[PDB]
Amino acid sequence: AETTVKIASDSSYAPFEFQNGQKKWVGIDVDIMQEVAKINDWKLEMSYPGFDAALQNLKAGQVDGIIAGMTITDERKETFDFSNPYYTSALTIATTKDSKLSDYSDLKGKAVGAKNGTAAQTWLQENQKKYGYTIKTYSDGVHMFAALSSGNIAGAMDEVPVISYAMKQGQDLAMNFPSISLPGGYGFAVMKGKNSTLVDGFNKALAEMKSNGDYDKILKKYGITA
Numbered sequence: 001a002e003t004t005v006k007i008a009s010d011s012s013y014a015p016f017e018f019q020n021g022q023k024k025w026v027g028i029d030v031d032i033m034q035e036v037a038k039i040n041d042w043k044l045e046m047s048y049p050g051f052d053a054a055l056q057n058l059k060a061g062q063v064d065g066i067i068a069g070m071t072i073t074d075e076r077k078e079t080f081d082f083s084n085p086y087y088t089s090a091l092t093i094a095t096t097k098d099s100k101l102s103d104y105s106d107l108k109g110k111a112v113g114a115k116n117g118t119a120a121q122t123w124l125q126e127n128q129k130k131y132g133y134t135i136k137t138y139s140d141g142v143h144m145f146a147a148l149s150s151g152n153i154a155g156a157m158d159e160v161p162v163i164s165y166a167m168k169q170g171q172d173l174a175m176n177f178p179s180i181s182l183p184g185g186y187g188f189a190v191m192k193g194k195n196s197t198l199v200d201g202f203n204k205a206l207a208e209m210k211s212n213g214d215y216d217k218i219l220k221k222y223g224i225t226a
Contacts, residue, residue: 001043002041002042002043003041003042003043004042004043004045005037005042005043005044005045005064005065005198006045006047006062006063006064006065007033007044007045007046007047007063007064007065007066007067008046008047008048008049008053008054008057008058008062008063008065008066008068009029009030009033009046009047009048009051009054009066009067009068010048010050010051010054010068010069011048011049011050013027013051013068013069014027014162014165014222015027015028015161015162015164015165015222015223015224016028016029016030016068016069016161016186017029017030017048017067017068017069025046025048027222028087028161028218028219028222028224029067029068029069030046031218031221032067032086032206032209032215032218033046033067033188035205035209035214035218036188036201036202036205036206036209039201039204039205039208039209040201040204040205042201047063051066051068051070054066054068058080058189058190058191059079059191061191064190064195064198065188065189065190065195065198066188066189066190067188067189069087069089069186070082070186070187070188070189071182071184071185071186071187072085072184072185072186072187073184076189077192078192079191079192080189080190080191080192081189081190081191081192081193081194081195081196081199082187082188082189082199083187083188083189083199083202083203083206084187084203084206085184085185085186085187086185086186086187086188086202086206087161087185087186087219088181088182088184088185088186089159089160089161089182089185089186090159090160090179090180090181090182091119091120091123091157091158091159091160091179091180091182092157092158092160092163092175092177092178092179092180093107093112093155093156093157093175093176093177094145094148094155094156094157094158094163094166094173094174094175095148095154095155095156095173095174095176095177096148096149096172096173096174097172097173097174099154099155099174099176101154101155101176101177102176102177103177104127104131104177104178105131107131107132107133107154107155108131108132108133109132109133109134110133110134110153110154110155111133111134111135111136111152111153111154112124112133112134112135112136112153112154112155112156112157113135113136113137113138113144113147113148113153113155113156113157114135114136114137114138114144114156114157114158115137115138115139115140115141115144115158116137116138116139118158119159119182120157120158120159121135121137121157123157123180124157133154136152136153141158141162141166144156144158145166145171145173148173149172155177159182160175160179160224161222161224163175164222164223164224164225164226165222165223165224167223168222168223168226169223188202
């Protein structure tokens with residue numbers, strides 16, 4: 001019967017992987033992986049220990065691959081082989097829907113938020129002298145978006161898919177600023193030199209899903225492009 005495939009992911013990264021109201025695992029990565037497995041006649045066993053644990057479990061041979069919004073980078077290619085990117089994310093500034101701010105130049109003298117430890121934070125730091133905002137740093141999304149709604153930041157930098165999902169959820173957000181592409185894209189990962197069948201299967205199924213409408217339907221479920 002079917003070949004079993006163990007894939008580990010993050011424990012909370014909406015809209016890529018997260019638990020719904022019924023505690024069921026959903027998200028872009030979940031839906032993509034489930035369909036990749038269906039197309040390839042694989043018996044999928046998903047686990048959600050968190051990204052760092054997933055990497056540990058993958059190196060230890062405890063799982064066969066990872067899908068967890070994992071950026072493809074030259075350094076990571078020293079340890080992992082990747083699929084083609086199945087999504088390429090981007091950063092932008094979220095505002096309330098009533099805000100007129102829309103240009104990175106409009107930020108002079110204003111407070112802009114980001115979550116600690118993220119690419120958004122780094123981009124803000126890199127471009128602060130360029131654009132002249134002040135940076136407020138938040139522990140997590142709930143706190144950052146509460147500051148935006150309270151008017152204590154004029155904008156909140158985050159990922160386009162994360163803001164899109166929040167907008168789909170009905171949060172008071174708009175994306176009026178340009179997007180800053182996050183190079184590399186997200187890929188399915190296996191250990192370098194191992195499991196090429198999984199990578200090839202992923203790539204083939206991805207191309208099929210893009211071509212047949214299923215990929216677009218998945219992204220739209222979570223509010224993306226859209």
